[PDB]
Amino acid sequence: YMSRYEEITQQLIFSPKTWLITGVAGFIGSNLLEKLLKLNQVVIGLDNFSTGHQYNLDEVKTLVSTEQWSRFCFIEGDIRDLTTCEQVMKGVDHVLHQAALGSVPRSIVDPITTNATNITGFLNILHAAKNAQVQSFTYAASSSTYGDHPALPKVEENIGNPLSPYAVTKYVNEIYAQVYARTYGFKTIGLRYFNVFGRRQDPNGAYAAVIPKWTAAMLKGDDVYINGDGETSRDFCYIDNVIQMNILSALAKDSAKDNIYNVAVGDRTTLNELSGYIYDELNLIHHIKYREFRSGDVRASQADVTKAIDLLKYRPNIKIREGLRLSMPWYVRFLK
């Protein structure tokens, strides 16, 4: 069990608060929405359906009662517009800021669009929240922020030079957050996600992350490409661990705020092994090419999550094999 997490969720049910989820129509945002409505929370969602999907909201609506669903207010809109951000902040207690453009390659082909959404939009949401004086502000940061820094495992204090325009944006979020605390006293929590996966992670289009991409390729019978030697490694973190950290963060005591936390499992998996993992799990459910390293790619990534453990009482409970067993049926269904 996850017990400070199980305490808090109980508390939420007994006295529901008002949550803003930006990027509510995406992977992590729709999983947050699914958990929060199942706890009877009031939830304001904001999304421009850029990379998200109206069908992600349709699926969540099939997972909760009509009464629970009636507590969700959705605004179609864009974090780049400050007014929009001020409007959705009205009466919000806790901010979970997930809206961003992901993908390192997307950011290399088009750094401008990546900047607008991840810096302008990020600062817009942050400033509006500062001004509405919400109770908490938790935002999606990134393991890419570790950069060319070689030390292993990854510890919050120790970062490198960013390796791509995407990594620049997610780092700038931490800097803006820390200057906002210093200048205004508005104390936030940044969450350095490491390679999140699970249900509703988009398998389509050029920018799919490796798990839904390879899972889909193997189901279709498409080539599976490993960019590089395949010893590149990641801390693959199943969605429920991320859902836990967001909620622990929103209800954190003040002293644990103005802090950055690695969100992961402490494990290390190469693309070669992963490929074995995806194939094996899929196969119990029933039904490869090497090429160049990808540009601006981080080489080795393994979180040290002692800090989240000690300070937020995080329990990292689902590891990659189990996470994948939980994920694959959603994929098989979704794709056929």
Ligand X SMILES: NC(=O)c1ccc[n+]([C@@H]2O[C@H](COP(=O)([O-])OP(=O)(O)OC[C@H]3O[C@@H](n4cnc5c(N)ncnc54)[C@H](O)[C@@H]3O)[C@@H](O)[C@H]2O)c1
Ligand Y SMILES: CC(=O)N[C@H]1[C@@H](OP(=O)(O)OP(=O)(O)OC[C@H]2O[C@@H](n3ccc(=O)[nH]c3=O)[C@H](O)[C@@H]2O)O[C@H](CO)[C@H](O)[C@@H]1O
β-pair type (237-238, 136-142): unpaired
Measured from the CB atom, is 33 or 159 closer to a copy of itself? 159
CB atoms under 10 Å from CB of 174, counted, come to 19
226 assigned binding-site residue: yes
Residue 332, token pair as written in the block? 């098989």
298 touches which of ligand Y, ligand X, a copy of itself, none (CB within 5 to 8 A by kind)? ligand Y
93 assigned binding-site residue: no
Binding span for a copy of itself by CB under 8 A among 59-67, 159-167, 225-233, 300-308: 159-167
Query: Should residue 115 be labelled a site residue for ligand Y when binding is judged by CB under 6 A?
Result: no
Number of chain residues interacting with a copy of itself (CB under 8 A): 28
26 touches which of ligand X, a copy of itself, ligand Y, none (CB within 5 to 8 A by kind)? ligand X
Query: Should residue 149 be labelled a site residue for ligand Y when binding is judged by CB under 6 A?
Result: no
Please identify which residue in 171, 236, 277, 331 interacts with a copy of itself, judged by CB under 8 A. 171
232 touches which of ligand X, ligand Y, a copy of itself, none (CB within 5 to 8 A by kind)? ligand Y
Measured from the CB atom, is 64 or 210 closer to ligand Y? 210
Measured from the CB atom, is 68 or 144 closer to a copy of itself? 144
164 touches which of ligand X, a copy of itself, ligand Y, none (CB within 5 to 8 A by kind)? a copy of itself
Binding site for ligand X (CB under 6 A): 23, 25-29, 46-52, 78-80, 98-102, 117, 121, 140, 142, 193, 195-196, 202, 209
